[PDB]
Coordinates of C-alpha atoms and ligand atoms in Angstrom, one line a residue:
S1 CA -1.8 -17.0 24.0
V2 CA -1.8 -15.5 20.6
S3 CA -5.4 -16.3 18.5
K4 CA -5.6 -16.0 14.6
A5 CA -7.7 -13.3 13.0
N6 CA -10.3 -14.8 10.5
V7 CA -9.4 -13.4 7.0
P8 CA -11.4 -14.9 4.3
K9 CA -10.3 -15.5 0.9
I10 CA -12.7 -13.9 -1.7
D11 CA -12.6 -14.9 -5.2
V12 CA -12.8 -11.5 -7.0
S13 CA -13.0 -12.6 -10.6
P14 CA -17.0 -11.9 -11.0
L15 CA -15.6 -8.1 -10.3
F16 CA -14.0 -8.3 -13.9
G17 CA -17.3 -9.4 -15.4
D18 CA -20.9 -8.7 -16.2
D19 CA -22.7 -10.7 -14.3
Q20 CA -24.4 -8.3 -11.8
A21 CA -25.7 -10.7 -9.3
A22 CA -22.4 -12.6 -8.6
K23 CA -20.7 -9.1 -8.4
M24 CA -23.3 -8.3 -5.5
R25 CA -22.3 -11.9 -3.6
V26 CA -18.9 -10.6 -4.0
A27 CA -19.8 -7.1 -2.5
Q28 CA -21.5 -8.9 0.4
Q29 CA -18.4 -10.5 1.2
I30 CA -16.3 -7.6 1.1
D31 CA -18.9 -6.0 3.3
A32 CA -18.8 -8.8 6.1
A33 CA -14.7 -8.8 5.8
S34 CA -14.8 -4.8 6.0
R35 CA -16.9 -5.2 9.3
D36 CA -15.2 -7.7 11.1
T37 CA -11.5 -7.9 11.4
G38 CA -10.9 -5.3 8.4
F39 CA -8.8 -7.8 6.0
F40 CA -9.5 -10.2 3.3
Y41 CA -7.1 -11.9 0.6
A42 CA -8.3 -11.6 -3.2
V43 CA -8.0 -14.6 -4.7
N44 CA -8.6 -15.4 -8.7
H45 CA -6.7 -11.9 -9.5
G46 CA -5.1 -13.0 -12.4
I47 CA -1.7 -11.3 -11.7
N48 CA 1.5 -13.0 -12.1
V49 CA 2.9 -13.0 -8.6
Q50 CA 5.5 -15.4 -9.2
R51 CA 7.2 -13.0 -11.6
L52 CA 6.6 -10.4 -9.6
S53 CA 8.4 -11.7 -6.7
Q54 CA 10.9 -13.1 -9.1
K55 CA 12.2 -9.7 -10.4
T56 CA 11.9 -7.6 -7.1
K57 CA 14.4 -10.1 -5.7
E58 CA 16.8 -9.8 -8.7
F59 CA 16.6 -6.1 -8.3
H60 CA 17.1 -6.0 -4.1
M61 CA 20.2 -8.3 -4.5
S62 CA 21.9 -6.8 -7.3
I63 CA 21.6 -3.1 -6.7
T64 CA 25.0 -1.5 -5.2
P65 CA 25.7 1.1 -2.8
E66 CA 26.7 3.4 -5.4
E67 CA 23.2 2.9 -6.9
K68 CA 21.3 3.3 -4.1
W69 CA 22.7 6.7 -3.4
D70 CA 21.8 7.8 -7.1
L71 CA 18.3 7.0 -6.1
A72 CA 18.1 8.0 -2.6
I73 CA 15.2 10.2 -1.8
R74 CA 16.1 13.3 0.2
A75 CA 16.2 11.7 3.9
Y76 CA 19.4 9.7 2.9
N77 CA 20.8 12.3 0.2
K78 CA 20.6 15.9 0.5
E79 CA 21.0 16.5 -3.1
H80 CA 17.7 15.2 -4.0
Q81 CA 15.3 17.6 -2.5
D82 CA 12.7 16.7 -4.9
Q83 CA 12.4 13.2 -4.2
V84 CA 10.4 12.8 -0.8
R85 CA 8.5 9.9 -2.0
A86 CA 9.8 8.2 -4.9
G87 CA 13.4 6.5 -4.9
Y88 CA 15.5 4.2 -2.8
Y89 CA 15.1 4.3 0.9
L90 CA 18.3 2.8 2.4
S91 CA 19.1 0.4 5.1
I92 CA 21.6 1.4 7.6
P93 CA 24.0 -1.7 8.2
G94 CA 24.1 -2.2 12.0
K95 CA 21.1 0.0 12.8
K96 CA 18.1 -0.4 10.0
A97 CA 17.4 -3.7 8.3
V98 CA 14.3 -2.4 6.4
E99 CA 15.3 -1.1 2.8
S100 CA 12.6 -0.2 0.1
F101 CA 12.2 1.3 -3.4
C102 CA 9.1 3.4 -4.0
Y103 CA 7.8 4.8 -7.6
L104 CA 4.3 6.6 -8.4
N105 CA 2.4 6.9 -11.3
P106 CA 4.6 6.3 -14.8
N107 CA 2.6 9.2 -16.2
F108 CA 4.3 11.5 -14.2
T109 CA 6.6 13.1 -16.4
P110 CA 8.5 16.6 -16.4
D111 CA 5.7 17.3 -19.2
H112 CA 3.0 16.3 -16.8
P113 CA 0.7 19.6 -15.8
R114 CA 0.8 18.5 -12.1
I115 CA 4.6 18.2 -12.5
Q116 CA 5.1 21.5 -14.3
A117 CA 3.0 23.2 -11.7
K118 CA 5.2 21.8 -8.8
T119 CA 2.0 20.5 -6.9
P120 CA 3.1 18.7 -4.0
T121 CA 3.1 14.7 -3.6
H122 CA 3.7 14.6 -7.6
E123 CA 7.2 13.6 -8.2
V124 CA 8.9 12.1 -11.6
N125 CA 10.2 8.4 -10.9
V126 CA 13.5 7.7 -10.6
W127 CA 15.1 4.5 -12.0
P128 CA 18.5 2.6 -12.2
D129 CA 20.5 2.2 -15.2
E130 CA 19.0 -0.1 -17.7
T131 CA 22.3 -1.8 -18.6
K132 CA 22.7 -2.8 -14.9
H133 CA 19.0 -3.8 -14.5
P134 CA 17.9 -4.8 -17.8
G135 CA 14.0 -5.1 -17.9
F136 CA 13.4 -3.7 -14.5
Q137 CA 11.7 -0.4 -15.5
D138 CA 9.8 -2.4 -18.0
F139 CA 8.3 -4.7 -15.7
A140 CA 7.8 -2.1 -12.7
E141 CA 6.1 0.1 -15.0
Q142 CA 3.7 -2.9 -16.2
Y143 CA 3.2 -4.1 -13.0
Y144 CA 1.7 -0.8 -11.7
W145 CA -0.9 -0.7 -14.5
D146 CA -1.7 -4.8 -13.6
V147 CA -2.2 -3.5 -9.8
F148 CA -4.1 -0.4 -10.9
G149 CA -6.5 -2.8 -12.7
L150 CA -7.0 -5.3 -9.9
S151 CA -7.4 -2.3 -7.6
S152 CA -10.2 -0.7 -10.1
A153 CA -12.2 -3.8 -9.8
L154 CA -11.9 -4.0 -5.8
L155 CA -13.3 -0.5 -5.6
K156 CA -16.3 -1.6 -7.7
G157 CA -16.9 -4.1 -5.1
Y158 CA -16.4 -1.5 -2.2
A159 CA -18.9 0.7 -3.8
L160 CA -21.6 -1.9 -4.4
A161 CA -21.1 -3.2 -0.7
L162 CA -22.0 0.4 0.6
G163 CA -25.2 0.5 -1.6
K164 CA -23.5 2.7 -4.2
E165 CA -23.3 2.5 -7.9
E166 CA -20.0 0.6 -8.9
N167 CA -18.1 3.7 -10.5
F168 CA -18.9 5.7 -7.1
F169 CA -14.9 5.3 -6.1
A170 CA -13.5 4.2 -9.2
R171 CA -14.5 7.3 -11.1
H172 CA -11.7 9.2 -9.0
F173 CA -9.1 6.5 -9.6
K174 CA -7.6 7.7 -13.0
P175 CA -4.3 6.6 -14.8
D176 CA -3.8 10.4 -15.8
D177 CA -3.6 11.5 -12.1
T178 CA -3.7 8.9 -9.4
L179 CA -1.4 9.3 -6.8
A180 CA -1.1 5.6 -5.5
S181 CA 2.2 4.2 -5.2
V182 CA 4.1 0.8 -5.1
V183 CA 6.8 0.2 -2.4
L184 CA 9.3 -3.0 -3.1
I185 CA 10.3 -3.4 0.4
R186 CA 12.7 -5.8 1.7
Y187 CA 13.0 -7.2 5.2
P188 CA 16.6 -9.3 4.9
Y189 CA 17.5 -12.2 7.2
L190 CA 20.5 -11.0 9.4
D191 CA 22.8 -12.9 11.7
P192 CA 23.4 -11.0 14.2
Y193 CA 20.0 -9.0 13.5
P194 CA 20.6 -5.7 14.7
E195 CA 18.6 -4.7 18.2
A196 CA 18.1 -1.1 16.8
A197 CA 15.8 -2.4 14.2
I198 CA 13.7 -4.4 16.7
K199 CA 10.9 -2.4 18.5
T200 CA 9.2 -3.9 21.6
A201 CA 5.4 -3.3 21.7
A202 CA 3.6 -2.8 25.3
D203 CA 2.4 -6.3 25.2
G204 CA 6.1 -7.3 24.7
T205 CA 5.8 -8.3 21.3
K206 CA 8.8 -7.6 19.3
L207 CA 8.0 -5.5 16.0
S208 CA 9.7 -4.1 12.7
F209 CA 7.1 -1.6 12.5
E210 CA 4.6 -0.2 14.9
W211 CA 0.7 0.1 15.0
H212 CA -0.8 2.2 12.6
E213 CA -3.6 2.8 10.2
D214 CA -3.1 3.0 6.4
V215 CA -2.6 6.2 4.5
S216 CA -4.9 5.3 1.5
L217 CA -8.3 4.7 0.5
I218 CA -7.6 0.7 0.4
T219 CA -4.2 -1.0 0.5
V220 CA -3.4 -3.9 -1.9
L221 CA -0.6 -5.9 -0.7
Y222 CA 1.4 -8.8 -1.9
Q223 CA 4.1 -10.5 0.6
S224 CA 6.0 -13.4 0.5
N225 CA 5.1 -16.6 2.6
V226 CA 6.4 -15.3 6.0
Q227 CA 3.8 -14.7 8.8
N228 CA 4.4 -11.0 10.2
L229 CA 0.9 -9.1 10.3
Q230 CA -1.3 -8.5 13.3
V231 CA -4.6 -6.8 13.3
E232 CA -5.8 -5.1 16.6
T233 CA -9.2 -6.5 17.9
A234 CA -11.0 -5.2 21.0
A235 CA -9.4 -8.6 22.6
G236 CA -6.0 -8.0 21.4
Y237 CA -3.9 -8.5 18.5
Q238 CA -4.3 -11.4 16.3
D239 CA -1.9 -12.9 13.6
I240 CA -3.0 -12.6 10.1
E241 CA -2.0 -15.9 8.2
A242 CA 0.6 -15.7 5.2
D243 CA -0.6 -16.4 1.7
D244 CA 1.8 -15.8 -1.3
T245 CA -0.9 -16.5 -4.0
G246 CA -3.2 -13.9 -2.8
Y247 CA -3.6 -10.0 -2.3
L248 CA -4.3 -9.1 1.1
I249 CA -6.6 -6.4 1.2
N250 CA -7.3 -3.5 3.8
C251 CA -9.0 -0.3 4.0
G252 CA -7.1 3.0 4.9
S253 CA -8.2 6.1 7.1
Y254 CA -9.6 7.8 4.1
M255 CA -12.3 5.2 3.7
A256 CA -13.0 5.5 7.5
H257 CA -13.5 9.3 7.0
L258 CA -16.1 9.1 4.0
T259 CA -18.0 6.5 5.6
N260 CA -18.3 8.1 9.0
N261 CA -16.0 4.9 10.5
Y262 CA -18.7 2.2 9.1
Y263 CA -15.7 0.6 7.5
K264 CA -12.9 1.3 9.8
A265 CA -9.1 1.5 9.1
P266 CA -7.7 -1.7 10.9
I267 CA -5.0 -1.0 13.1
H268 CA -2.3 -3.4 12.4
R269 CA 1.6 -3.9 13.0
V270 CA 4.4 -6.0 11.9
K271 CA 6.3 -8.7 13.9
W272 CA 9.9 -9.0 14.1
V273 CA 10.9 -12.2 12.3
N274 CA 14.4 -13.0 11.2
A275 CA 13.7 -14.2 7.6
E276 CA 14.4 -13.1 4.1
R277 CA 10.9 -11.7 2.8
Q278 CA 9.2 -9.6 0.7
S279 CA 6.7 -6.8 1.3
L280 CA 5.1 -5.2 -1.8
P281 CA 2.3 -2.8 -1.0
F282 CA 0.1 -0.8 -3.5
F283 CA -1.5 2.1 -1.8
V284 CA -4.7 3.0 -3.7
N285 CA -4.8 6.9 -3.4
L286 CA -7.1 9.1 -5.5
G287 CA -6.1 12.5 -7.5
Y288 CA -5.1 15.5 -5.7
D289 CA -8.2 17.4 -5.9
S290 CA -10.5 14.4 -5.6
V291 CA -13.2 14.8 -3.3
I292 CA -15.8 12.6 -2.0
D293 CA -18.8 13.7 0.0
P294 CA -18.9 11.5 3.2
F295 CA -21.9 9.7 4.3
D296 CA -23.3 7.5 6.8
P297 CA -24.5 4.0 5.5
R298 CA -26.3 3.4 9.2
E299 CA -28.6 6.2 8.3
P300 CA -31.5 5.9 6.1
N301 CA -30.9 9.3 4.4
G302 CA -27.1 8.6 4.5
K303 CA -26.5 12.0 6.3
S304 CA -23.0 12.6 8.0
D305 CA -22.0 16.2 8.6
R306 CA -18.1 15.1 8.0
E307 CA -16.0 17.5 6.3
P308 CA -15.2 16.7 2.8
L309 CA -11.3 16.1 2.6
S310 CA -9.6 16.9 -0.5
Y311 CA -7.5 13.8 -1.5
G312 CA -4.3 15.7 -1.8
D313 CA -4.4 17.2 1.7
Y314 CA -5.1 14.2 3.4
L315 CA -2.2 12.4 1.9
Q316 CA 0.5 15.3 2.5
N317 CA -0.7 15.6 6.1
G318 CA -1.0 11.7 6.4
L319 CA 2.6 11.1 4.9
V320 CA 4.0 13.2 7.0
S321 CA 2.2 12.1 10.2
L322 CA 3.1 8.3 9.8
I323 CA 6.8 9.1 9.3
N324 CA 6.5 11.3 12.7
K325 CA 4.8 8.4 14.6
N326 CA 6.3 5.5 13.4
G327 CA 10.0 6.7 11.8
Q328 CA 11.7 7.1 8.7
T329 CA 11.3 3.9 6.6
Ligands
LIG1 C1 2.7 -3.1 6.5 C2 3.4 -3.1 5.0 C3 2.1 -2.4 4.0 C4 4.6 -2.3 5.0 N1 4.5 -1.3 5.7 C5 4.3 0.1 4.9 O1 4.4 -0.2 3.7 C6 4.2 1.5 5.6 C7 2.9 0.8 6.4 S1 1.3 0.8 5.8 N2 3.8 2.4 4.9 C8 4.4 3.4 4.5 O2 5.7 3.5 5.1 C9 3.7 4.7 3.9 C10 4.7 4.6 2.7 C11 4.1 5.6 1.4 C12 5.3 5.8 0.2 N3 6.5 6.1 0.6 C13 4.4 6.8 -0.6 O3 5.0 7.8 -0.8 O4 3.1 6.6 -1.1 C14 5.7 -3.3 5.8 O5 5.8 -4.2 5.6 O6 6.3 -2.6 6.7
LIG2 FE1 -0.2 -0.5 6.8

């Protein structure tokens, strides 16, 4: 009754090199996937995902309630009015299964100009005690830059796919000001599983997270090997097969805006599965003042007439809207 989505595996290794024709062949595959279901797996990416999964598991399984309160975002701890994005998102025993830890650009320090100006969406990361979680902060900050590098290469592929010079997106994706985030999500095995944490879709499917478009330019996702994602097509939802060696890639709504919906942001949802698993997205966000003039690849002259949208305004509105529509995570 439920079909399986065509999600190609694309070797992205040429995007790190200087063979221009091989890069074009990767771009063609990105274009094709982006115009079909909107998802592809990036393989030969060079990231040590075994260590990513191990270190994340050690953190999730060793952190205590005391530490979670100390790291909690404002939604769970009224004392932390400056932590809207960065920190711990608590589970609620008997009611809410998912829990997660979100961190932002490690360069956002108290001395950073955007932090000194109190610009919305910029926060300084909070971390657990080094002595209770030795090496965790070092690993997590290094991971940020590893996935930043992969994402920068992917953005070159997207640029070439759309007929632009390879730095068209990447020039706005900078270590000093990127609003990109990593979220380390734990979906636990629970017996009994709290019914309040299961949502029923219109078609009767039991869900952990309802349909949505991503608030991102692109989303770069690593998940353990438990099938859970579905993508909407005109003929209904289709299952995305899991692969715990690759990164699952899709566009967010900022890409849809700037391409006049040529690359749509695919609508997707998370099925309920009672299994211990990890979901580790990196949301590729630009800088607060980054603006890309919209264009329409379908038109010879590329004219669009959609309004340019500052990334900061897009992100602030998008994060709130997603909470209002799909709930506080
Ligand atoms: C579908 C997965 C990416 C994951 N869902 C998610 O991460 C969902 C939907 S994309 N994303 C969010 O809630 C937005 C988090 C943004 C983050 N706090 C920030 O300040 O940047 C899951 O497994 O639930
Ligand atoms: Fe998503």
